Design a protein around this motif. Structure first.
Motif: not given
Ligand SMILES: CN1CCN(Cc2ccc(NCc3ccc(F)cc3F)cc2)CC1
Ligand SMILES: CN1CCN(Cc2ccc(NCc3ccc(F)cc3F)cc2)CC1
Lengths: 57, 278, 250, 177, 250, 278, 57
Positions: E175-176, E172, E167-168, F247-251
């Motif tokens: 970042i990890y 992006n 869900g991302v 962690r990346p923000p949710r989309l």
């Protein structure tokens, strides 16, 4: 006449002031900062001390 | 003297290696009534661990330092029955089950008390409810043993001159007060295995030592065209507590407010067989 | 009192409340291999604790007509915990052992056992000039039976008890490290066996380091009791074990 | 159990099959029916979190002439509890010998992924199992009873602790007394 | 030259003659557990060398239409040498890892891969409000396929690549900790991942510490050559592994 | 000791002139996974500038230091359905979308909590509304896991003796309290990629670690002739925060309160062509 | 036992007192005055330090 003292906080990683306003000691706040304890009264009530390493009898 | 200044972790675990000797820490004898004091380091190899856990939350001061309801009652602002317009409660701490159990884990107690009162009101149902009434006011009166007792809402006894009292108005914070250790002994007693008369007759049990007095509550002067019902809850919160002689917690359900009477209960639940673990 | 002994290896403990002293091989305690005595080049592996612990092999039943039993090591522990896995995955191995043999009976029983570890206990076939497979002398942790009469099946080792299957007088086994379990005054025997061999290390699947023998010299006897047999249990624990030469699992 | 007092005695027999299970139980001091009402269990039920080691003490209440050995093992959490002595002996265990000293103590070490465990234990915070097996069997001389009993005692070590106070669920009422 | 790297763990060695630097988690090197941070009482076991070595998982085939793959650890190494046995026999475990992903092609090939380790890579089901078994997300060392189109089978995780099944935004994931394998100037990526978790130790069968993802951002391309695909290989090596809580094999 | 005493600007820009050398700051290699550290001073001539800007407002402490609604529910003072006269909410922080998103930018968190309650009441519509009712009072009770749970408004469980509770009266300021880091680990976990049973079966996901307890609310003794509905809102405000592993923000939009399930979403919006800039 | 400290204010062109009243550190106000930070953990996680002026490879 103010008392300063430390407050619970974490471990690896902090002072509050208290003043009494009333003339009766019963009005003070709870003294929940005491942590001394001794369980030998209920766990070792025997007369002759017994060494754990040595046999009981 | 403008100011004045004023933590105990559990035991750590020490590293242990293989052993082969005549010492036998594991073997003991419970017949002595002495609980062992072995540690995991004495029966298997262990690493060095630093414990920062603390037993702060298990102190008796903190265990009992929580307010709990001990009594609730209802009284009406206006009604035909005189006895129904005010409350008269002999003080005791054995009417609500949870707080009773909590206290009954110790034979003797000695503490200060903090009392808080929560009062709420509601309009009784009826055919006609359209009315306008200003804010209500309530009076709480404490009558030590032997003092005069009111017999009606508008009795002369409500003119307290020595009996402490509190006047409270709805919409504000709950009332509160503190009381000192008001006992005649060197400590309060939850249990009393004895009689009242020296001939081993009469009342038997803690009831005998319950002489703390009464509490009375009433509406100051409210008298509505239509009935209004109010409820009061009393909360006690021990402070500066000391306890002696612990006793096992109760197992059977309570059945009387002034006795230890009970009905036999099974020790615990059952399972399929001694080996079942699922 | 010196009648009580306690042994702690790894995450296991043995407690005997009535026992004699512990015998220690030829006066040598087990130890790791020294730098000036080694031959293999690569780094060894030393999984102490994981492998140096007690493992109770299965149990036998001592009857009035029992004659004796034997086990062969280290093959007896071939499939016992991480010790077996390490032995499977490595070409070379080295380890001493601590053998503890339990046997308890009432004050009214009588009997005597001989517990002895025989290094290089080579055995001869039942029929002279006839080979036998590697199944009549070691098949895991199961114990093997001696025989009072002379053996006859060619598929098995000579089990004549009085010769110990080695062509030597059974009464002379006292020369090896040993102990006696006398029901009058004893309940267990403890032996610490160092690593004995002609080379610093050896494969544990091809070579039987030593053999354990239990022989009743005085047959069990009792009268008017509800107990019909006396169980016997054997427990072993490798000490200072180190492996070398990693390869594919056998 | 027609007689309630029977709950405190673990049967033991002579001429027992070899390597038999004596008892087994889950290690849920605050939830399991076995430890629910013990002196230790009652205290925990007033709290939500607990941590530290535990002590289990066993006392043999047979005759003086009887003898035997028992294996007591603690198995950390896993997919399946042990079914035979060979499985049990892999985990933490102690070999118990019965003699002049009639009591033996098994110290259950604190092995956990988290600093604390929930009193209302679930799959995530399991604690393992404890089982006891015959090591050698019980032997008796003539003129003695054919059965004996064992008792178990539970207590906390000196590193035990609890946290978060909650109200206990064992006691309830429906009407004012 | 700094384009050559050599890594030696246990009895295995990795040599790459064309590589970029090594990335090190969040700047933290793997290490053993300290005395003042531990919680379990008993002695741990530290079978270094036996478990701290490289294990090459199986290989995948990179085609022009590939979309990506993922592996989940430590379950991926569940049946790999003594590491698997130790993980089976113990209640608690703890270890960091060194991940090395190889992929080589001629000067005339073009493409780009993203290598990233995602801790706590929780995934959602293909159909909302529908549970799935522990087989559509980890089944040993076998790799799992992402999908370009939206998934529809309720028995499987949502494999839509552009959402990474989390869900991302897929873009992006930088970042990890990560590295890029660009065929112009690179042949392998090395990542050193310390032990990241909310507790000192945890069971390795119930908890997926982190997930490894390989995603081709620029699809493979070539022309007029006899090579039809570019194999990809993954190698992992636990570091400073220690276990605790011995029990029966799962 | 009557008193005791106890700022970081961004980097400045340094003057740079024409350059011609073998150093090439602009050229780099992202394959290493290392973000560049070039500055505008390394690619064009720049003047000297002193920056007084500060990053104070972007600290995690300030980013999360805002109260946010996490739950709201309604309960009636009087009604036929018993379950409709009180609230029972298992505590979790994944029901309101904004606060959930904010938290989900970090894998692990460790903070103290400040809880505030906003309570409002309204008279339900009906044919007859003429009535007079004094001010109402409400009770909030917190039940740690495993404690007794009330089954009706007037249950015995409402006599809290150990469970903390708050009694509040309308017309005053909202209630408030503080809670310490009440976890069983060394930090809270927003995500958990694992199962419950050791056989890789059972519940899967963060639900597994959600064991914070329940909250119950009721009218103390209000029982009106006509129904009155009340609403409660709960606000959380982290304090003393620490965070790990961003962690990346949710989309994709949220769809379940105890799962990560979602539907595939486009990466972003579209435009006419790669050159369109209008 | 009072703490004095500076308060955010402008730049080119200022003290507040605080006292703690409760015995639990969790009751203190937010400590939002810390501004230390270090981004090298996420921006330069490499093993060998790379100089910006020098070539990357
Ligand atoms: C039988 N014992 C009765 C007393 N109980 C402890 C206790 C004692 C006094 C009180 N309250 C005294 C009191 C204090 C102030 C008042 F206004 C009225 C009161 F009744 C409460 C609990 C222990 C058991
Ligand atoms: C799955 N995790 C659940 C916890 N969440 C953080 C968190 C933890 C506890 C709380 N509140 C605890 C609490 C504190 C005081 C109460 F009265 C009731 C409560 F539930 C709120 C948020 C992170 C995600």
């Amino acid at each position: 006449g103010a008392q300063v003292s430390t407050q619970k906080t974490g471990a690896h990683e902090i002072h509050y002031t208290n003043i009494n306003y009333y003339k009766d000691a019963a009005s003070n706040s709870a003294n929940r900062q005491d942590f001394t304890q001794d369980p030998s009264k209920f766990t070792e009530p025997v007369k002759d001390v017994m060494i754990k390493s040595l046999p009981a009898l | 003297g403008d100011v004045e200044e004023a933590v105990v972790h559990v035991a750590d675990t020490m590293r242990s290696g293989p052993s082969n000797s005549a010492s036998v820490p594991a073997l003991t004898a419970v017949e002595t009534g002495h609980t062992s004091q072995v540690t995991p380091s004495d029966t298997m190899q262990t690493r060095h661990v630093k414990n920062y856990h603390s037993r702060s939350e298990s102190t008796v001061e903190n265990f009992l330092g929580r307010s709990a309801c001990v009594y609730m009652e209802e009284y009406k602002t206006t009604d035909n029955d005189v006895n129904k317009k005010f409350v008269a409660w002999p003080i005791n701490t054995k009417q609500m089950v949870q707080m009773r159990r909590k206290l009954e884990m110790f034979t003797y107690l000695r503490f200060d008390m903090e009392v808080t009162f929560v009062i709420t009101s509601r309009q009784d149902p009826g055919t006609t409810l359209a009315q306008d009434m200003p804010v209500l006011t309530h009076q709480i009166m404490y009558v030590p043993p032997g003092g005069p007792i009111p017999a009606k809402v508008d009795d002369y006894a409500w003119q307290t001159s020595t009996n402490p009292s509190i006047f409270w108005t709805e919409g504000n914070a709950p009332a509160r007060m503190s009381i000192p250790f008001i006992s005649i002994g060197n400590a309060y007693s939850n249990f009393y295995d004895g009689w009242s008369n020296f001939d081993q007759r009469g009342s038997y049990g803690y009831n005998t030592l319950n002489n703390l007095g009464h509490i009375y509550v009433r509406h100051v002067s409210g008298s509505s065209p239509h009935p209004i019902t109010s409820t009061i809850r009393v909360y006690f919160k021990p402070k500066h507590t000391r306890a002696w002689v612990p006793r096992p917690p109760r197992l059977c359900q309570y059945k009387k407010a002034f006795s230890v009477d009970f009905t036999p209960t099974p020790i615990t639940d059952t399972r399929k067989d001694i080996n079942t673990v699922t | 009192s010196d009648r009580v002994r306690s042994i702690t290896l790894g995450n296991s403990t043995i407690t005997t409340q009535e026992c004699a002293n512990v015998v220690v091989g030829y006066g040598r305690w087990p130890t790791y291999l020294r730098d000036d005595e080694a031959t293999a080049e690569d780094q060894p592996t030393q999984p102490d604790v994981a492998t140096c612990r007690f493992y109770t092999l299965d149990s036998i039943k001592w009857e009035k007509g029992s004659v004796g039993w034997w086990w062969k090591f280290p093959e007896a522990l071939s499939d016992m915990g991480l010790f077996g896995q390490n032995m499977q995955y490595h070409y070379l191995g080295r380890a001493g052992y601590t053998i503890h043999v339990q046997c308890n009976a009432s004050k009214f029983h009588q009997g005597c056992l001989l517990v002895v570890c025989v290094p290089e206990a080579e055995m001869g076939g039942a029929v002279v000039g006839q080979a036998f497979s590697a199944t009549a002398m070691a098949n895991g942790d199961k114990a093997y039976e001696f025989t009072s009469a002379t053996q006859s099946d060619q598929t098995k080792v000579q089990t004549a008890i009085h010769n110990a299957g080695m062509g030597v007088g059974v009464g002379n086994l006292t020369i090896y490290p040993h102990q006696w379990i006398n029901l009058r005054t004893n309940n267990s025997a403890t032996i610490v066996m160092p690593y004995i061999n002609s080379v610093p290390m050896d494969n544990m699947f091809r070579h039987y380091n030593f053999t354990l023998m239990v022989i009743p010299f005085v047959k069990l006897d009792y009268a008017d009791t509800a107990s019909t047999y006396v169980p016997i249990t054997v427990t072993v624990a490798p000490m200072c074990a180190e492996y070398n030469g990693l390869r594919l699992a056998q | 159990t027609t007689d309630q007092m029977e709950m405190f005695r673990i049967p033991v027999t002579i001429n027992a099959p070899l390597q038999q299970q004596v008892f087994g139980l889950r290690l849920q001091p605050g939830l399991d029916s076995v430890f629910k009402h013990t002196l230790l269990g009652e205290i925990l039920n007033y709290y939500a979190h607990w941590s530290g080691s535990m002590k289990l003490t066993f006392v043999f209440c047979g005759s003086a002439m009887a003898t035997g050995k028992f294996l007591i093992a603690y198995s950390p959490p896993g997919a399946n509890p042990p079914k035979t002595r060979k499985d049990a002996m892999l985990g933490t265990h102690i070999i118990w010998d019965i003699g002049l000293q009639s009591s033996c103590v098994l110290c259950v070490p604190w092995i956990s992924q988290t600093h604390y465990r929930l009193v209302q234990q679930d799959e995530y915070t399991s604690a393992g199992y404890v089982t006891c097996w015959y090591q050698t069997g019980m032997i008796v001389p003539p003129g003695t009873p054919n059965s004996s009993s064992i008792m178990c005692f539970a207590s906390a070590c000196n590193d035990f602790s609890v946290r978060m106070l909650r109200d206990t669920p064992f006691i309830s009422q429906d009407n004012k007394l």
